[PDB]
Amino acid sequence: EARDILKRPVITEKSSEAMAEDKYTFDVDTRVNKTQVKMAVEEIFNVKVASVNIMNYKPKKKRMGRYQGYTNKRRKAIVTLKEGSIDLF
Amino acid sequence: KAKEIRDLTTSEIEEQIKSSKEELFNLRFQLATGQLEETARIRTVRKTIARLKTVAREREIEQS
Amino acid sequence: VKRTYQPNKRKHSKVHGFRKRMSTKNGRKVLARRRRKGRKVLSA
Amino acid sequence: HIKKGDNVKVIAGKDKGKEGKVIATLPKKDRVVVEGVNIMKKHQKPGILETEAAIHVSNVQLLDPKTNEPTRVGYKFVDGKKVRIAKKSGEEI
Amino acid sequence: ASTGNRRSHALNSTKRRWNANLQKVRILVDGKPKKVWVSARALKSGVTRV
RNA sequence: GAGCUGUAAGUAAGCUUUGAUCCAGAGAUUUCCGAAUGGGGAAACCCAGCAUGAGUUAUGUCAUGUUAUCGAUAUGUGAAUACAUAGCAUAUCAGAAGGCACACCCGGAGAACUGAAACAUCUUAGUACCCGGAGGAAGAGAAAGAAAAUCGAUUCCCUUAGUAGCGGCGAGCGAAACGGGAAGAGCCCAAACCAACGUUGGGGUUGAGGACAGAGUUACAAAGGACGACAUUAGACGAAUCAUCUGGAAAGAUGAAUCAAAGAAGGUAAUAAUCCUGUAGUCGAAAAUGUUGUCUCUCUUAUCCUGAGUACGACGGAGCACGUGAAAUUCCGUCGGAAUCUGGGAGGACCAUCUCCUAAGGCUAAAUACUCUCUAGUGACCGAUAGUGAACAGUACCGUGAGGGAAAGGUGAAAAGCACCCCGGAAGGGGAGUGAAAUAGAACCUGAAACCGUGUGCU
RNA sequence: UGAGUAGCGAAAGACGGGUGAGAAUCCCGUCCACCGAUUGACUAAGGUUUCCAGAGGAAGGCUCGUCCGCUCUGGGUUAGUCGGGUCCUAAGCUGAGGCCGACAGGCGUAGGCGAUGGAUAACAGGUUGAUAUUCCUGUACCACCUAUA
RNA sequence: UAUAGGUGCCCGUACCGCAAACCGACACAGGUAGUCAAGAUGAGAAUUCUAAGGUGAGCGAGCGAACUCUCGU
Ligand SMILES: [K+]
Ligand SMILES: [K+]
Ligand SMILES: [K+]
Ligand SMILES: [K+]
Ligand SMILES: [K+]
Ligand SMILES: [K+]
Ligand SMILES: [Mg+2]
Ligand SMILES: [Mg+2]
Ligand SMILES: [Mg+2]
Ligand SMILES: [Mg+2]
Ligand SMILES: [Mg+2]
Ligand SMILES: [Mg+2]
Ligand SMILES: [Mg+2]
Ligand SMILES: [Mg+2]
Ligand SMILES: [Mg+2]
Ligand SMILES: [Mg+2]
Ligand SMILES: [Mg+2]
Ligand SMILES: [Mg+2]
Ligand SMILES: [Mg+2]
Ligand SMILES: [Mg+2]
Ligand SMILES: [Mg+2]
Ligand SMILES: [Mg+2]
Ligand SMILES: [Mg+2]
Ligand SMILES: [Mg+2]
Ligand SMILES: [Mg+2]
Ligand SMILES: [Mg+2]
Ligand SMILES: [Mg+2]
Ligand SMILES: [Mg+2]
Ligand SMILES: [Mg+2]
Ligand SMILES: [Mg+2]
Ligand SMILES: [Mg+2]
Ligand SMILES: [Mg+2]
Ligand SMILES: [Mg+2]
Ligand SMILES: [Mg+2]
Ligand SMILES: [Mg+2]
Ligand SMILES: [Mg+2]
Ligand SMILES: [Mg+2]
């Protein structure tokens, strides 16, 4: 279940500053809670989690040509480790 | 792959399911960091999981 | 000048929403008519 | 009946009477690509590149292995597997 | 209740109903007494009064 | 049987003759909302109780199962109240719910504009709308019938006939029987009376009968099997043309051939029976659904009664073509209320005679009605302001909402969709190229008129 | 057609410097002017990405535009304590059984839902282009769990 | 009738917000609940000028006729 909870890492300027501060940003399944996120990270990466922050992103308006629709809604989790680190390369 | 999967035992198929899911998850992380360069492995691993779950489901229905 | 439409999420959903339509026989007739016409939107 | 690598003769178009090997096939368009047939002279932006354009499959015809005449294609069931036979002579392709 | 017409002298017609002469009566349904509405014609043409 | 990763390019990475993509049958998976059913709720969300199981020292968190209401079945607890009953728990089941083309059908309920040259009876019309219930059909159906020499269940078609009749005898409404056809089918109970514990089995099913003294899962009783055959759901084979001319291209023209149980139709660079897909014809099924057969299979070989709150009557209504009429016939409400084969009903008030029939229990295929669908086809039907509102949409847009509701098809045979040079920030142009053609350059076939410009022969 | 006509939606701008193919209209600067019980600041409803950065100038902007609430690409919303739910009830709505009604349905008991009210534990500072009582720093508080007590 | 260690979920959080982003078909002189409430003057949240802060209003340049409008004598 844990590898379903964690979808992908998020790579941005703000996420990179977070990684400099030992915070790792993941896109997670939109149904899971932050406790599940913490358990999944601990299990997958064999690290210790200090805290997990979470937020939702609404669908964003997007178009190509005459077709206007929306992107997928997102759930973003920021995981603060107390022990260890995660190698994304 | 189904013919080869059917040669595996029940405990082996579960182990294959776990290991395939880990491989797929590793592929997804590599894709998100722009490191993959081999994107056809993703579909191949996904269908292997589908075949593995199909064979397990057949055995349980057959035995039941 | 104060106009007629003063939008209100709660009022809109309570008066014109799916559950309000479901709650009466005539509301279900509305939903059936819109499904028959092929509307994308059935209710608020 | 027309397959890649087959030797065919063009029976309609600018290249009528020409012969050449079937470079490629396109079943959804019912078209084929034949070596040295239907050159197109496209403007490429990286010059003028000469390449063959597809032609309708019904504009080429297989050649008879015996009499070299253009022939239509029939089928037989030699040793179970379906095989191609020239309608002109009756010999396999 | 049935439906028909009230007719005037000029034969104007208005819709009306004919209602049964229902009388609430203590009756033994399924072996247990209960007060049910039963018509007088039915009572004369023996439910079973208890 | 060689390509393939939808439309759909575009790359990227791959799959596929060790048989992929694709097609058909059968299976597996099938998030959440929705009758929605653990509780709630502003649909697609929030919050839980039990049991089981990961996990954690432990809590938090997580996974599976289960928990609506009314119903059935059977175990308890059990009021006022003695007994009981109601009620309350449990256990098992899964019966109902909602949806539709709900078009056609049956039932409940039921307008008005309108016509009558006004209008109230009447008409519009038992129509529209609403509500309930179902099926592939429904409804009706086995004479208390039609009739007046006799026929023999029901339904539907023709005709009878715009007749008989109804009608402020106005406007209008309007049969049926006979005759001709489609189709065709008949049955089961209640009761007399027997034998077992009033309830069960036997008895019986009618115009006089009864008591007494080979047929079938289409009604007539209901479950299976064995096998065959046929059909549908993928497919396969399938005859016969070459040359020259004009052309960018030949199927056109000309010449000379060929096939035909195949000269239907599409496509192919212009108009093809012989180039392609096909057509006539013929073949084909692992699997699943259907139809239909033989064997099997079972089932079977006038003493008494004959439908009672009924028939019928009065009042008030309704349905009958029929408006209360001389109104028979059928139904509803209220109230009254028979007879018992020496019986009862009908033959258009009613009486008598005669004739026909035997109500107050039930079942019953077919000929009939309809088309959102599916398969195969058709048209002196449309051809982009037409034809669906919709050839690219119930979308855009409008409205709080019910709801209203568009516009918009065409390069070219083939993208060969204009390399490169020049002015220009770009847009756009001029060349050069592709193309048969670019005033076919995508706002792309043809390119009318209004309208807007440039030049000028006469004025 | 009217016709290059009416209009271009309350008001104070000027100059220097810059950018640029192009500047009254964009950026920077100085001076000037206007609001200031507000043209300032903060909540709510409502809207729903309009927010930020880089790039762009066809169309939108009543002129222009190098600019923008416009176009392209990539980003941005962090909570035990804030507001709401896992608490409470009001009006009202709904309602097991139940009462009533041609049908459809109407009403209603227990109960339930329902804030605009009641209850309820966190403050100050720092930090980004875009979040902050949410991140970070310092110092707390509340509920629950386990161990010593 | 105390200390100690540990755990703490879901939804919202961007931005506009007396408006160019809400209701008014508009980048519309209109409408839109509550809160904060500086100095001089003053009874005052009146008046005038200012503070904090914000703004110069999405067509301009001339001319300085009739006429119209808004102002002063
Ligand atoms: K009906
Ligand atoms: K008239
Ligand atoms: K008996
Ligand atoms: K009467
Ligand atoms: K909001
Ligand atoms: K002047
Ligand atoms: Mg949050
Ligand atoms: Mg539910
Ligand atoms: Mg519910
Ligand atoms: Mg139905
Ligand atoms: Mg009239
Ligand atoms: Mg052929
Ligand atoms: Mg009679
Ligand atoms: Mg009888
Ligand atoms: Mg046209
Ligand atoms: Mg049209
Ligand atoms: Mg032309
Ligand atoms: Mg044209
Ligand atoms: Mg004009
Ligand atoms: Mg002028
Ligand atoms: Mg004028
Ligand atoms: Mg003027
Ligand atoms: Mg003017
Ligand atoms: Mg202005
Ligand atoms: Mg303000
Ligand atoms: Mg911005
Ligand atoms: Mg402009
Ligand atoms: Mg933008
Ligand atoms: Mg109620
Ligand atoms: Mg901000
Ligand atoms: Mg904010
Ligand atoms: Mg808006
Ligand atoms: Mg405004
Ligand atoms: Mg305003
Ligand atoms: Mg006000
Ligand atoms: Mg003032
Ligand atoms: Mg403006």
UniProtKB/Swiss-Prot annotation, chain A:
GO terms for MF: rRNA binding; structural constituent of ribosome
Q: Origin, by domain of life? A: Bacteria
Asked if the record carries the keyword Hydrolase, the reply is no
Question: What InterPro entries is this protein classified in?
Answer: Nucleotide-bd_a/b_plait_sf, Ribosomal_uL23-like, Ribosomal_uL23/eL15/eS24_sf
- Disulfide bridge partners, by residue number: none
Give UniProt keywords alphabetically: Ribonucleoprotein, Ribosomal protein, RNA-binding, rRNA-binding
* tRNA-binding among keywords: no
What family does this belong to? Belongs to the universal ribosomal protein uL23 family.
Please describe what this protein does.
One of the early assembly proteins it binds 23S rRNA. One of the proteins that surrounds the polypeptide exit tunnel on the outside of the ribosome. Forms the main docking site for trigger factor binding to the ribosome.
Record-linked HAMAP family: Ribosomal_uL23_B
Question: How does this polypeptide assemble, per the annotation?
Answer: Part of the 50S ribosomal subunit. Contacts protein L29, and trigger factor when it is bound to the ribosome.
Provide the protein name. Large ribosomal subunit protein uL23
Swiss-Prot record, chain C:
The record's gene field reads: rpmH
| Listed GO MF terms | structural constituent of ribosome
Q: Where is this region: Disordered?
A: 1-44
Which segments of the protein form a coiled coil according to its record? none
What family is reported? Belongs to the bacterial ribosomal protein bL34 family.
InterPro entries linked to this entry: Ribosomal_bL34, Ribosomal_bL34_CS
- Quote the NCBIfam families the UniProt record gives: rpmH_bact
Membrane-traversing stretches: none
Protein known as: Large ribosomal subunit protein bL34
Q: Is Ribonucleoprotein one of the keywords UniProt gives this record?
A: yes
Cite a single GO BP annotation: translation
Tell me which UniProt keywords the record has, alphabetically.
Ribonucleoprotein, Ribosomal protein
Question: Cellular component GO terms, alphabetically?
Answer: ribonucleoprotein complex; ribosome
From Swiss-Prot, chain D:
UniProt keywords (A-Z) are: Ribonucleoprotein, Ribosomal protein, RNA-binding, rRNA-binding
Q: Which Gene3D superfamilies match?
A: 2.30.30.30
CC per GO annotation: ribonucleoprotein complex; ribosome
According to its UniProt entry, one GO biological process term is:
translation
State the CDD domains in the record: KOW_RPL26
This protein's record includes keyword Acyltransferase: no
UniProt cross-references to PANTHER family, sorted A to Z: MITOCHONDRIAL RIBOSOMAL PROTEIN L24
Q: What does this protein do?
A: One of two assembly initiator proteins, it binds directly to the 5'-end of the 23S rRNA, where it nucleates assembly of the 50S subunit.
Q: What is this protein called?
A: Large ribosomal subunit protein uL24
Q: Which organism is it from?
A: Staphylococcus aureus (strain USA300)
Gene field: rplX
Curated annotation (Swiss-Prot), chain E:
- GO biological process entries: translation
Q: Under the cellular component aspect of Gene Ontology, which terms does the record hold?
A: ribonucleoprotein complex; ribosome
Q: What does the UniProt keyword field contain?
A: Ribonucleoprotein, Ribosomal protein
Give GO terms: molecular function aspect only: structural constituent of ribosome
- Identify its protein family: Belongs to the bacterial ribosomal protein bL28 family.
The protein, known as: Large ribosomal subunit protein bL28
